């Protein structure tokens, strides 16, 4: 098991084809999750499950700048169940970090930071019991 909130070094920051995997069960009653692909203190990343935001489950996904956020991009596609293992898989491309979610897809998001070999740490928190969280290239 591991503690949550937890941080997974990205050593070298991020680069195309580089697969990063988060394995989890979800708590029951769950309320959040959230991954934070950070460079420094700005969030490249933030893919963040609501589990209810006005009784609807949501996904909203944003980068933080300079301690601001910028515009939410929000999928109703929801693949996540409290009580349930699930596996995020977030794999870099040129254009977009793309995300699957117990093998299916669920969402890209274009890259808004763009020096990705700064992007060095992967913070994961929220209503999970986190199994591991690694990296490969494909
Ligand atoms: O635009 C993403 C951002 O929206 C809000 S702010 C906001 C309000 C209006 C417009 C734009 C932004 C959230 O407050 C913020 N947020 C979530 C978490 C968080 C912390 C945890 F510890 C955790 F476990 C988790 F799952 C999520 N921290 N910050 C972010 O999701």
């Given at each position: 098991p591991?503690?949550?909130?937890?941080?997974?070094?990205l050593?070298?920051?991020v680069?195309?084809?580089?697969?990063?995997?988060?394995?989890?069960?979800?708590?029951?009653?769950a309320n959040?999750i959230?991954?934070?692909?950070?460079?420094?203190?700005?969030?490249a990343?933030?893919?963040?499950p609501?589990?209810?935001?006005?009784?609807?489950?949501?996904?909203?996904?944003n980068?933080?700048?300079?301690?601001?956020?910028?515009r939410?991009?929000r999928?109703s596609?929801?693949?996540?169940?409290?009580?349930?293992?699930?596996?995020?898989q977030?794999?870099?491309?040129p254009d977009?970090?793309?995300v699957?979610?117990?093998?299916?897809?669920?969402?890209?998001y274009?890259?808004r930071?763009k020096k990705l070999?700064?992007?060095?740490?992967?913070?994961?928190?929220?209503?999970?019991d986190?199994?591991?969280?690694?990296y490969?290239?494909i």
């Open positions: 591991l503690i949550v909130p937890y941080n997974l070094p050593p070298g920051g680069v195309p084809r580089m697969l990063i995997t988060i394995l989890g069960t979800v708590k029951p009653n959040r959230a991954l934070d692909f950070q460079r420094g203190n700005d969030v990343f933030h893919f963040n609501r589990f209810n935001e006005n009784n609807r489950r949501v996904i909203v996904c980068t933080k700048l300079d301690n601001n956020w910028g939410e991009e999928q596609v929801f693949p996540f169940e409290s009580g349930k293992p699930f596996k995020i977030v794999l870099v491309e977009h970090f793309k699957a979610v117990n093998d299916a897809h669920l969402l890209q274009n890259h930071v070999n700064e992007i060095s740490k992967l913070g994961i928190s929220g209503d999970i986190l199994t591991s969280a690694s490969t290239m």
